[PDB]
Amino acid sequence: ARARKGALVQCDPSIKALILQIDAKMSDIVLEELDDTHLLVNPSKVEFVKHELNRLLSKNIYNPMD
Amino acid sequence: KHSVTQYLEEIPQQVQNRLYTSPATCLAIYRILPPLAKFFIMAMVFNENEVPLLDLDKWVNSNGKLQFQNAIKSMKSLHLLIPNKSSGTLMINLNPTFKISLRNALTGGEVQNSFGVVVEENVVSLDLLDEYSANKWETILHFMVGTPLAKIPSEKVLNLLKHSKLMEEVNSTGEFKITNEGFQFLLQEINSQLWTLLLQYLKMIETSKMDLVDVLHFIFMLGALEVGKAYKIDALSETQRIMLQDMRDYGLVFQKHSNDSIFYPTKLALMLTSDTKTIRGLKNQDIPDGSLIVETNFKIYSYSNSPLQIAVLSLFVHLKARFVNMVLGQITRESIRRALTNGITADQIIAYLETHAHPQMRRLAEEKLEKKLELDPNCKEPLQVLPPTVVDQIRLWQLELDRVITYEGSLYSDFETSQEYNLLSKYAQDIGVLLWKDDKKKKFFISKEGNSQVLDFAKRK
Amino acid sequence: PADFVPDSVSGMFRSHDFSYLRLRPDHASRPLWISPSDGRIILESFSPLAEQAQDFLVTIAEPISRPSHIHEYKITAYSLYAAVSVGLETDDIISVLDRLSKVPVAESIINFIKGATISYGKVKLVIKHNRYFVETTQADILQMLLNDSVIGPLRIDSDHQVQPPEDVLEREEEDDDIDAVHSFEIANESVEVVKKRCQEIDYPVLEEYDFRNDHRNPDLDIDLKPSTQIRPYQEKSLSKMFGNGRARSGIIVLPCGAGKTLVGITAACTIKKSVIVLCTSSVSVMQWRQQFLQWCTLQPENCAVFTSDNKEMFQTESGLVVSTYSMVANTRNRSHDSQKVMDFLTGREWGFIILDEVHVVPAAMFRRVVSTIAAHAKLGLTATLVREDDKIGDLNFLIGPKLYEANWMELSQKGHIANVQCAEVWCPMTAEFYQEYLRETARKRMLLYIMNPTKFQACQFLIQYHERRGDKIIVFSDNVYALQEYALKMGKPFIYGSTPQQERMNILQNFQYNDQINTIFLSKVGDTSIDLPEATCLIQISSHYGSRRQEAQRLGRILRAKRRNDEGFNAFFYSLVSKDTQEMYYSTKRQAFLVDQGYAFKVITHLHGMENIPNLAYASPRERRELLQEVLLKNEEA
Known part of the structure; x- marks a missing residue:
């Protein structure tokens, strides 16, 4: 008997841990x-x-290759 | 495709019958219909005796006879016809008003409206106004896109855009930038650009002076031909004049200044229902007008250009160094984030770019394609037709950039059994609320505001 | 210092700002219009005929040659320096750019181009008729001899000498620049610093090392021997060391191993002087002496090579020499008779010296050869010049920038170097290792990366795919610690550093022309030996940052060293990229120059059919979760 105002986020296993x-x-x-x-x-x-x-995905790459 | 037809059919018959007075419209809408409609309409056009149904089904043989439905649905959908199931059959005939509205037009009837164009001394030049609106018609794109030139200054036009709210930009700061609609704004250039807007006029068209025929007629009358005078002098209702003022204000109409004349029929009106050749100071030549380079090296490759479409193409790539007919701009994994910074997928980009800027890439479609169409089963390894390498990387980056979905509101949690789900959540998947349907979840999701049918039946379970 | 950075810096001259374009000159003139300010390359509507135009474009910048009308281009500062060999009418390129003045003509860039044509051929370092002198030759670097003090005060007012070209011969500028503003005869003492002083005084001065114009020699223990032949990529390099005045030398970047001794044979044959040769390791060097050293032009007897255990005849022959740097690039030395060899040859005025794949070699050890030979000329031969040790003095101001690149997609239209279609399979990741990867620390985090369940499911699939369509495999990976476990958990051979010589033999003998035991693993020192003439199925699994360069270089010898000339050559490369992991971005940064080379790459996160593999251990993930329990161990050692 419940409805907390929540915010679902569809995700992935690995990112979940990240999350x-x-x-x-x-x-x-x-x-x-x-x-x-x-x-x-x-x-x-x-x-x-x-x-x-x-x-974290910024922690992943930062992708400047500059 | 918003399929203006869809807007059309929205109204009830009396309004439809209201409009069928203006014959050209009847003809105009005639063009709209799928060919079968066009066909059978003629079949009934000149026989003043309503007719059975199976006969028509007996006109068509097998496969394709589904279009019959696709046909008959349509005409019935707007109810141009009038069914008569008197003798168990379906005795059918058009809206005779409309039917005669056509026939009169078809054979020189009393159509003063559709023939409102009172030709006069032709003072129209080809380049004369060829961009004269095209400037305003182009600048608005920039003003809409957001650029150096105030090409989107139309207070009503802007208020239209703001009222239309199709653009994703900060209206609080004033912006109406490339939303998905803005992205769509980039998408449907002419047919899309014109129609996609035109409804906005109707979108704003709800308050005063309905006069839809005087509205619509002002459209397809424009859609008719460049009759110039004979209407703009008098042969137009005041609603036409405001529409005339609006049309020129919309740019979509070739009305000159002095506020007393019959405006010229700008090319736009032709383009309005052309679906044909559409291109058109004195240098106006295509196809190379849209000039750019497509390739898997992630950069601007531009000899030719559309001095706005560039910055439009920039809307997914950073400008770094403008030059006269070229610009340094690297469209890369970084650059694509902008289209996602707005949010829209550059999936529209793919074919469009596979369609646009090929004028500068014509040797490309043969350095790349080699016409790798028939050699398909002779080689297990095709070659870049159409070039997917960055597109894969794009499609890669597509999820790779997107890579998330978020929901919010409350959270219904830990349900009881398989009815509220397989009684009222596949039914939430049958009354359109849900923001998640995971059967075993026992928990389901909406957007907070959206419960009017969501805290209602699970209580009943 | 002695050398200069200027040998690994392509992709420049990109002159274009937020308002680069001037009033489009080439707008009217549309026969050809490259990006001028950049030096970019683009054809024009009055002129589409390309293919023959390869050379003219070769003079400047970097193309995109899967471009359609044309490929790309660019400016290049030292690139004009290289062009001096022809040394054509400088304004002609600008005259060529005359049509190509696409915007209003960028005379400044044109001047920059005139500047871009400043140095090369404008060299300045004196030389004299069987000696060296303190003068200068071309305008670009003229004062690089005369006004000097190691070249000018290290230029000695001696008048002229071939026979008088010796006593001095402020050391032997026998390899001096373009010569003779009033040229003061060169001395015997102090240019070991001049080479450093040069760019120190920044002289873009074109060194010149002659064929017979130094009679400090009744020209010594070489002689011309031409027996060799040529594949389409030789002659330019050979004549590249001539120039003006008298001859010269330089540095060349190549995928090596192409009979590069043969090209070495010529210039040495063409000076008849004192020369030595060098290679990496008795680990590496023996792939040289006897399958690609005698089909050529040399007598069968002369030379000696030295390891004092792998020693030779020293104090014996007047003829030429060959050794290893790392041998004496260090206070490492086995038999003090090394110092019976050390002193002379070090102190000996060698006419020329040969260094090979000095790429990996660090200044922190590379300066020894700088401090070792100081030969009157030098050989520049490595793998890559854009680097990680991109430091100040690359061997250029010793010898020069790269002289000849390779060629891949359109000259190999003479000889196919192994058509590539690279593969990276984007295998997703599980948080189970990854969670404590979020708990990890220094690079012992990367070991967790190796603990990915996905590699296995694909690994056999690669073996299956290759043999389902039946072509045998060569694989690439790293971190043997468990990678060795992978091997005899892949059913495939194990290869590891710290290994006896005996066991190295059992790898190939009943293995090469056979068709059954058809898989192989690689170590981190075994790659320093050989790759098979077989199985261009190339699969990367594990790598490591920074090594990426030589790791990418490691991939080189497979395909480029191949030369067979068929119609298609359906060859491919493959790699493992475990998704959602620390490295792929750096691997993309590694990938960043993959299709730079025109040797392309295609990605498949999952192909048509990866899951077709029923022989994978850990088929259900509890063995993969058994693996977790083993995954702990070393990372619990860690």
Whole structure:
């Protein structure tokens, strides 16, 4: 009997951990590890997190090759 | 394709019958219809006795006879005809108003409106206004695109764009930039550009002076031919005048200044229902007008250009160094992020770019294709037709850049059993709310605002 | 210092700013219009005939030759320096650009082009008629001899000498630049620093090392021997060391191993002087002495090579020499009789010296040969010049920039170097290792990268694919620690560093012309020996940053060293790229110059049929989760 105002995020297994790791210092911002391809997240920090999520794939490449 | 037909049919018959007075429209809409319609319409056009149905089905043989439905649906969809199931059959005939609205037009009837074009002393030059609107018609793209020139200054036109809100830019800052609609704005150049807009006039057209025939007629009358005078003097309702003012304001109409004359029929109106050759200071020659280089080296390769379409193409690639007829701009994995910074996939880009800028890439479609069409089963390894190498990388980067989907609202969680899902969530997948349907999830998703049928039945389960 | 950076820097002159284009001159004149300010290359509507125009474009910049009308182009500062060999009418290129003044003609660029034509052929370092002198020859570097102090005050007012060309011979500028503004005879002492002083005083001065114009020699223990032949890529290099005045030398970038001794034979044959030769390792060198050293022009007896265990006849023959740098590039030395050899040859005024694939060789050890021979001329032969050690003095100001590139897509229209279609399979990743990869640290993170379940499912598929359509394989990988485990968990041979010589033999003998045991693994020192003349199915699995260069260079010897000339040559390359991992971006940065070379690359994240493999151990992921328990170990050692 519930409907928390949540923010689902379709995801991937590996990125989930990333996303988990995102919460792993930015916790509570994820809400439920629905599955590998779905995650309840924070309207107050969502793409903010996905920006943080970008940071890791930014931590991935940084792709300047400059 | 918004398929203006779709807009057309939206209205009920009386309005349709309202409009069928203006004969040219009837002819105009005639062009619109699928050929079968066109065909059978003629079959009924000159026989004033409603006719059975199977006969028509008995006109067609096998495969293709589905189009019959695709035909009969359409005509019925706008109900041009009038069914008569009196004797169990279907006795059919057109909207006779419309039918005579055609016939009169078809054989020199009393069509003063469709024949409103009162030709006069032809003061029109080919280059005369050839871009005279095309400038305004082009500058608006830039003004819409957002550029050095205030080609989008039409307060109404802008207010139209803002009212149309099809552009993804900061209207708070004033921007209406390339949204998906803006991307679509880039997509459908002429047929798309004209029609895709034209409805905006109707979109804004809800408050005063409905006069749709005087509205629509002002369109297809424009769609008729460059009759110039004889209407703009008088032969037009005031709604036409505002439409005339609007048309010139929309640029789509070749009305000169002095506010007292019959405006020339700018080429746009031809382009409005042309679907043909569409191109057209004194240097105006194509196809090379759109000039650019397509290749797997991720750069600008531009000898020729459309001095706006470039910056338009830039809208997915950073300009780095403009030169007279060339620009340094690297369209790369970095550059594509911008189309995604707006958000739109550059999937429209692919064929368009495979279609556009080939004027500068004509030796390309043979350095690359080699006409690798028939050698397809002779080699297990084709060659760059059409060039996918960056496109794969694009398609690669496509997910690779996108790589996420986010939802928000509440979260329904941990349901009970397989009805609320296989009674009212495949039914949520049958009343259009859901922002997730994972059966076993026992949890489902919408957008917070969107519950009017979402906290309603699971309660009932 | 002694050398100069200027040998690995292509892709320049790109003169174009936010408003580059001047009033389009070539707008009217549309026979040909390359990107002028850049030096870019583009055809014109009054002129589409391309193919013969390969050479003229060769003079300037970098093309895109899967371009349609034409390929790309660019400016190049030292590139004009190279062009001095022909040394044609300088304004002619500008005159050629006269039509190509696409914008308003970029006279500044044109001047830049006039500047781009400044140095090469405008060299300046004196020389004298069987000696060296303190003068200068061309306008570009004229004062690089006269006003000097190691070339000018290290130019000695001695009048003229061939027989008087010796005592001095401020050391032997026998390889001095273009010569003789009033040329003060060269001395015997101090140009070991001049070569450093040069760019130090920045003289773009065209060194010249003659064929017979130094009679400090009744010209010594060489002589011409021409028996050799030629494939379409030789002669330019050979005449590249002539120039003006008297002859010269330089540096050339090649995929090596193409009988490069043969081209070495000529210039040495063509000076009849004192010369030595050098290669990497008794690990490496023996692929030289006896399958590609005698079908050529030399007598069968002379030379000696030295390791004091792999020693030779020293103190014996007046003739030429050959050794290894790393042998004496170091206080490493086996038998003090090395110093019975060391002192002279080091101190000996060698007319020429041969260095080969010095690419990997570091200044921190490369300066020894600089400090070792100081031969009157030098040989520039390595793999790649754009580098990781892109440091200040590359061997250029010693010998020169690259002289001859290779050629791949359109000269090989004379000889096919192994048509490539590269593959990178984008295998996704599992967080299970990756989670503690988020818990990891220094490069011992990368080991976790090796712990990917996907490599296995594909690995056999590669073996299956290759043999399902039946062509045998050559693979590439790294980090033997478990990669060796991979091998005898792949059912395929294991190859590892720290290995006895005995076991190295059992790899090929009942293995080459047979058709059954048809797979191989590679170590990190075994690659320093040989690659098979077989199985151009090339599959990369594991690599490592920075090594990428030589790793990419490592891939080189397979295909370029091949020369067979068929119609198509359906050959391909393949690689493993575990998705969602730290490296692929750097691998893309490695890929960044993959199709740079025209040798292309195509990607397949998943092909038509990868999953067709039923023989994969770990078919269900609990063995892959058994693997996790093994995945711990070394990374729990870590």
